Design a protein around this nucleic acid. Structure first.
Ligand code: NA
Ligand code: NA
Ligand code: NA
Length: 327
DNA sequence: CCGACCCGCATCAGC
DNA sequence: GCTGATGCGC
DNA sequence: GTCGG
């Protein structure tokens, strides 16, 4: 619905959520507030009272009370107070740096370090991830237009195939569901020589090639199965350079690939529904496998999965195109 | 009432 | 030095 | 903070 509907309320709840996560270090309070903000962002009516909102799943008494106060006054005293609190807004700001979580932001603010400029002055005190997150502070908060995501997909698929024509790579995420923009690029990768019951350089060779053509510009972390880093589309040689973007690459065993693709394609609501349905039919689905249940509830051995459709076949579901996996 | 609320890698704490 | 905990982002 | 066993 139009933000102007309940946008003030969902803005309030989101701010409350960020303070729970970054200042109170209460991840569960944080996600409750986000949950509430979501179910209200979808509600197609200008809420008139907290009691109206409490009918929705995820809205309890506390959030009903804060909505009442927001409607009667246009603000929340506690939010107003926390907004003007130097330490709290500084801690909350520093977590916008990737690699600075609530704990690091707390230690920095406890030492006088409150601003980007303060961070730029104290490189010595930042690990490698945090230095990168500082270096690209602005670029990382930008969304990625789908056309750029396609340009990025082109490069990734090409270089992967150049390394080994037997690799399979799938750009999952909202992008695969058709989204007009993305926040990062999530690449799922596999190779028939890598299974659950089976090379330590399959991921490395792909990362290496993507660095050699100067697509991957920085590394946040890299191991045998998970790469998190930075990439950038090549400049038009006279146009303004593209912003740097976050990219993750995961190597998954071939026998768990399509389960992984299903999961990391989402949406989160969709996955929940799918999993819910699969239990009804005597199956359990996680990000790795689908396994049958016994009458007693004991899971059996993972079932052979050679395509996304196979998952749907097991649970007696018509295959849903990624475009139609919004829920 | 009161516990649940979804792991790979970098780095630290401890030994 | 090795092993486990924690922070972080997902 | 919200839910539910
Ligand atoms: Na409710
Ligand atoms: Na952060
Ligand atoms: Na080949």
């Amino acid at each position: 619905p139009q933000e102007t509907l309940n946008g003030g309320i969902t803005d309030m709840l989101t701010e409350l959520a960020n303070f729970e996560k970054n200042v109170s270090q209460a991840i569960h309070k944080y996600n409750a507030y986000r949950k509430a903000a979501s179910v209200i962002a979808k509600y197609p009516h200008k809420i008139k009272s907290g009691a109206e909102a409490k009918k929705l799943p995820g809205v309890g008494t506390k959030i009903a009370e804060k909505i009442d106060e927001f409607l009667a006054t246009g603000k929340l005293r506690k939010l107003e107070k926390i907004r003007q609190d130097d330490t709290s807004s500084s801690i909350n700001f520093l977590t916008r740096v990737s690699g600075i979580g609530p704990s690091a932001a707390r230690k920095f603010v406890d030492e006088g370090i409150k601003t980007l400029e303060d961070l730029r002055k104290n490189e010595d005190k930042l690990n490698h991830h945090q230095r990168i997150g500082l270096k690209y502070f602005g670029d990382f908060e930008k969304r990625i237009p789908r056309e750029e995501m396609l340009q990025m997909q082109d490069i990734v698929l090409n270089e992967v195939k150049k390394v080994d024509s037997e690799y399979i790579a799938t750009v999952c995420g909202s992008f695969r569901r058709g989204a007009e923009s993305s926040g990062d690029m999530d690449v799922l990768l596999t190779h028939p020589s890598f299974t659950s019951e089976s090379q330590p350089k399959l991921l490395h060779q792909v990362v290496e090639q993507l660095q050699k053509v100067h697509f991957i510009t920085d590394t946040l972390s890299k191991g045998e199965t998970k790469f998190m880093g930075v990439c950038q589309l090549p400049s038009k040689n006279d146009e303004k350079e593209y912003p740097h973007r976050r990219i993750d690459i995961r190597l998954i065993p071939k026998d768990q690939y399509y389960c992984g693709v299903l999961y990391f394609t989402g949406s989160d609501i969709f996955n929940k529904n799918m999993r819910a349905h699969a239990l009804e039919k005597g199956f359990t689905i996680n990000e790795y496998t689908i396994r049958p249940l016994g009458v007693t509830g004991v899971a059996g051995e993972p079932l052979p999965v050679d395509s996304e459709k196979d998952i749907f076949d097991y649970i007696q579901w018509k295959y849903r195109e990624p475009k139609d996996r919004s829920e």
